């Protein structure tokens, strides 16, 4: 029993489009208007984040066709830099990165779905936490049931969020067509543009939050049918669509609201809904909830496969990377992902763990590209279906290095505790991997709890 090969091209487009378009297009625009001062600089920030993500994803497309194995961005560091830094990337991805980005989007789903019951109010926070946990547990059950069901869910909710954004787009177009064009006249357009890269960088960080997940199809390769045509085709179809929809949606936001409205607001989407429909204005936050539901599904689907592939290499315990027969789904990895996500419901505010750790994210992203360039020279024994032009990785590495170095500058005490946490995985590594010839007291207990979990979930190892 191995996993399968049943993800087609449209399923890959759905995975990428649905996982990228989550909550950032409804939450972050205040954060980029606040710290870039002007509508003009804000819209340029959105376009700059767009082209940055496009360049990085093309580098990942040729990376993923070179080393065509699952668990991307961890398999690529394991191929180049070896066991220990790959374990450090896996340990931070397992403990912080994945089960915070899932829980944030689940919480946004809950609040924007309960918003039509408490219009001019804060929604009660315990009900929001409970509905978020319900979302996560239900999508875990659907993913444990079958792989085709999860892809059908992804298709439906990707289509739903695309129609929901096309509505907000053409409403702001017909607002222009009514001929009362208050903002976006090409004379004002730019006042308040401050200067001082030291704060616009932080604005850039907010924009990059809306582009997270541009490399998740790399994590879920080895499930694709013909992943030599289909993976670069899926990336190159998926991302220009996303950056186009993002700049048009920010424009349609700017056609209706004034600037200090958008700085003083807590939800730009419900303002757009109230202004333009009034009655039947409960439509917009329902569709925001549907968006966040779809992206939580996509992130669970890729995180399970990452922890699967990490268990096959001997970095994680052996009960992960066991497949349940018949069903043919990696059940204990999905259970582990769900539990790690639900543990973040004890956070008072986890939207501040971002900017504690973005430097490590872009560090490993740039390290994979450096390793790709090194592998282009010190291994010309590989076949490359797409060999991208060089200096596109060089400029991408320079941009990532710029981002890291300016993160160390403005907030060094932010990056310090992040460095302590990312080296806190080192005793874990030595205790787990380096200590073969373990004491005999522990091997029997590990075998016992592994065979107990197997007898519970009915999962067998991978072999065929």
């Amino acid at each position: 029993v191995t996993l399968q090969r049943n993800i087609t091209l449209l399923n890959g487009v759905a995975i990428i489009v649905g996982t990228i378009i989550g909550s950032g297009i409804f939450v972050t625009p205040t954060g980029v208007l606040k710290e870039a001062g002007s509508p003009g600089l804000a819209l340029v920030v959105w376009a700059a984040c767009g082209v940055f993500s496009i360049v990085g994803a093309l580098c990942y497309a040729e990376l993923g066709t070179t080393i065509s194995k699952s668990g991307g961005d961890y398999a690529y560091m394991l191929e180049v830099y070896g066991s220990l830094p790959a374990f450090l990337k896996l340990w931070i991805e397992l403990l912080i990165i994945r089960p915070s980005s899932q829980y944030i989007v689940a919480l946004v789903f809950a609040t924007y779905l309960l918003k039509p019951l408490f219009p001019t109010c804060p929604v009660p926070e315990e009900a929001a936490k409970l509905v978020a946990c319900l979302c996560v547990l239900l999508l875990t059950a659907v993913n444990c049931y079958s792989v085709k069901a999860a892809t059908r869910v992804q298709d439906a909710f990707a289509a739903a969020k695309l129609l929901a954004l096309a509505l907000i787009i053409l409403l702001g177009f017909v607002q222009i067509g009514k001929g009362d064009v208050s903002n976006l006249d090409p004379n004002f357009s730019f006042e308040g543009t401050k200067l001082d890269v030291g704060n616009i960088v932080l604005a850039l960080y907010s924009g990059l939050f809306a582009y997270g997940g541009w490399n998740y199809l790399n994590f879920v390769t080895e499930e694709m049918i013909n992943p030599y045509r289909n993976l670069p085709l899926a990336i190159i179809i998926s991302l220009p669509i996303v950056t186009l929809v993002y700049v048009l949606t920010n424009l349609a936001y700017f056609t209706t609201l004034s600037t200090e409205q958008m700085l003083s607001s807590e939800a730009v989407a419900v303002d757009f809904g109230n202004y333009h429909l009034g009655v039947m204005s409960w439509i917009i936050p329902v569709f925001v909830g549907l968006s966040c539901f779809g992206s939580v599904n996509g992130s669970l689907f890729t995180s399970s496969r990452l922890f699967f592939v990490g268990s096959r290499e001997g970095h994680l315990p052996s009960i992960l990377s066991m497949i349940h027969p018949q069903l043919l789904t990696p059940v204990p990895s999905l259970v582990f992902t769900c539990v790690m996500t639900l543990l973040y419901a004890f956070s008072k505010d986890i939207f501040s763990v971002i900017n504690f750790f973005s430097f490590f994210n872009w560090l490993c992203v740039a390290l994979a590209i450096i390793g790709m360039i090194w592998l282009r020279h010190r291994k010309p024994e590989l076949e490359r279906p797409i060999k991208v032009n060089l200096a596109l990785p060089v400029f991408f590495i320079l941009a990532c290095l710029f981002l890291i170095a300016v993160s160390f500058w403005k907030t060094p005490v932010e990056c310090g505790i992040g460095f302590t946490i990312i080296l806190s995985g080192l005793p874990v590594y030595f205790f787990g991997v380096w200590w073969k010839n373990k004491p005999k007291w522990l091997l029997q207990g590990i075998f016992s709890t592994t065979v107990l979990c197997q007898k519970l979930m009915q999962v067998v190892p991978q072999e065929t």
């Binding site: 408490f118 208050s182 003083s264 007898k455 067998v460 190892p461």
Partner: protein, 471 residues
């Protein structure tokens, strides 16, 4: 394989009865715990308090109004036309005012009734094309224009000694002209010289609302007594009435508290306007140490604050001689007052005061920013409570938004606060520690939580503390 069993060995051992029972029992336990969490979320939602409906506000509920009596003295000599006013809307947008009461501009000769036409603009201000350019120029800056219409604004008696009949029937025809010209409201002043004035105001209020519900009518008296004011508002309930009911006094704050609370009691907490007169400045009634304390009070009471031009800089007719007390010159720059070239200073102009963060105009801007933005200052609820000998202390709270607590010391000797409320409802009881937004006098730190049993106040100080909706 690696640290566990293989395929056929497990399918041998993990297929026995009892293990199948344990698996189905765990599946049923999962799907029951999920429904338990769903029911818990539902009973948390339906046991929550609903929120109040917003009171469907108008445009004159949002911020302050700005009265420009004399046009020729607002800019200066020569450029005292309606076209010159168009260059000042960026300053009025800096003040965040929402309205603009332009002075009477129509063709009025003198006590000759027959040569007074309320439909023709006097040539000294411009003509109609300048006016309707000004209207849309203000409209694009989101500033409404209210047009004063007092007929005899050059003579002594403002309402034409002669019978009011002809006068009052030409005022009626003026409204239906200037409304479809495009103005947003009207103001009639000095209605104590109008015989049976209570009956004429209802007809004009009918006509003004019979055009749109986004229209305003302001009336002005010089009456400072409560019973004569209440007789104007017996049939009219949506009339803004400015009067000198507040000015007259101000030596002690327990007399100001009684005035405000008696006015709100006698009218049943309806929407009102707060002023010190119908056309004068603040400095015509107050000494110059009390101008910050009154600007803190007028921006936090439940109504619409109305100011004249120059109350944001503390303009004074008794500081520059050889000048009318009814139309002083607005001190824009140092060169603004030509005669006696050197009597002005730097702290007396808008150009000089736009830098100093402890100036009067710097206080006006922050207060007019807070008033048009926060909900509990927009349509909140008012509750005054008892305090020390000379204090005026009250609280504004809407539903669940951030409450506000204003403490004013009208006295001269400094004193402790003694904020013993004990009568405020439980939705608005004050905590032990509250923030601080501003103070009228410098020498405090804006932002740190200060605690409300050792709160002391210096001479003529006011405080704008803050706390959120909690237990």
């Amino acid at each position: 394989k690696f640290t566990g069993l293989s395929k056929e060995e497990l399918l041998k051992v993990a297929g026995s009865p009892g293990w199948v029972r344990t698996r189905w029992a765990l599946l049923l336990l999962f799907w029951l715990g999920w429904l338990g969490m769903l029911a818990g979320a539902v009973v948390i939602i339906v046991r929550a308090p609903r929120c109040r409906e917003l009171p469907a506000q108008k445009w004159w509920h949002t911020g302050a109004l700005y009265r420009i009596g004399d046009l020729q003295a607002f800019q200066g000599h020569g450029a005292g036309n309606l076209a010159g006013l168009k260059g000042r809307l960026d300053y009025l947008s800096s003040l965040k005012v929402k309205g603009l009461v332009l002075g009477p501009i129509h063709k009025n000769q003198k006590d000759d009734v027959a040569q007074t036409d309320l439909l023709q603009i006097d040539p000294n201000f411009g003509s109609k094309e300048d006016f309707d350019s000004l209207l849309q120029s203000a409209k694009k800056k989101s500033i409404r224009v209210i047009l004063d219409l007092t007929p005899n604004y050059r003579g002594e008696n403002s309402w034409f000694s002669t019978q009011v009949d002809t006068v009052a029937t030409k005022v009626k025809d003026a409204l239906e002209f200037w409304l479809q010209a495009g103005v947003d409201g009207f103001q009639v002043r000095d209605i104590e010289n109008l015989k049976d004035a209570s009956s004429f105001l209802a007809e004009w209020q009918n006509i003004t609302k019979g055009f749109s519900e986004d229209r305003l009518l302001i009336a002005g008296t010089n009456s400072s007594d409560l019973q004569q004011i209440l007789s104007l508002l017996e049939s009219n309930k949506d009339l803004l009435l400015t009067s000198s009911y507040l000015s007259d006094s101000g030596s002690t704050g327990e007399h100001t508290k009684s005035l405000v609370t008696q006015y709100l009691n006698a009218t049943g907490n309806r929407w009102c306007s707060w002023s010190l007169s119908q056309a004068r400045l603040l400095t015509s009634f107050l000494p110059a140490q009390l101008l910050r304390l009154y600007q803190l009070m007028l921006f936090t009471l439940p109504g619409t604050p109305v100011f004249s031009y120059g109350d944001e800089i503390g303009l004074d007719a008794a500081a520059l001689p050889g000048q009318p007390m009814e139309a002083p010159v607005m001190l824009w720059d140092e060169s603004s007052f030509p005669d006696i070239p050197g009597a002005v200073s730097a702290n007396m102009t808008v150009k000089g005061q736009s830098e100093d963060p402890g100036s009067l105009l710097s206080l006006f801007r922050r207060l007019s920013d807070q008033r048009s933005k926060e909900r509990s200052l927009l349509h909140g609820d008012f509750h005054a409570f008892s305090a020390g000998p000379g204090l005026f202390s009250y609280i504004r709270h809407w539903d669940q938004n951030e409450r506000f607590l204003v403490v004013l010391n009208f006295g001269d000797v400094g004193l402790s606060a003694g904020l013993q409320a004990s009568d405020l409802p439980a939705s608005a009881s004050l905590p032990a520690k509250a923030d601080l937004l501003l103070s009228t006098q410098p020498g405090r730190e804006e932002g740190s939580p200060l605690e409300l049993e050792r709160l002391k106040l210096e001479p003529h100080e006011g405080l704008l503390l803050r706390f959120p909706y909690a237990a």
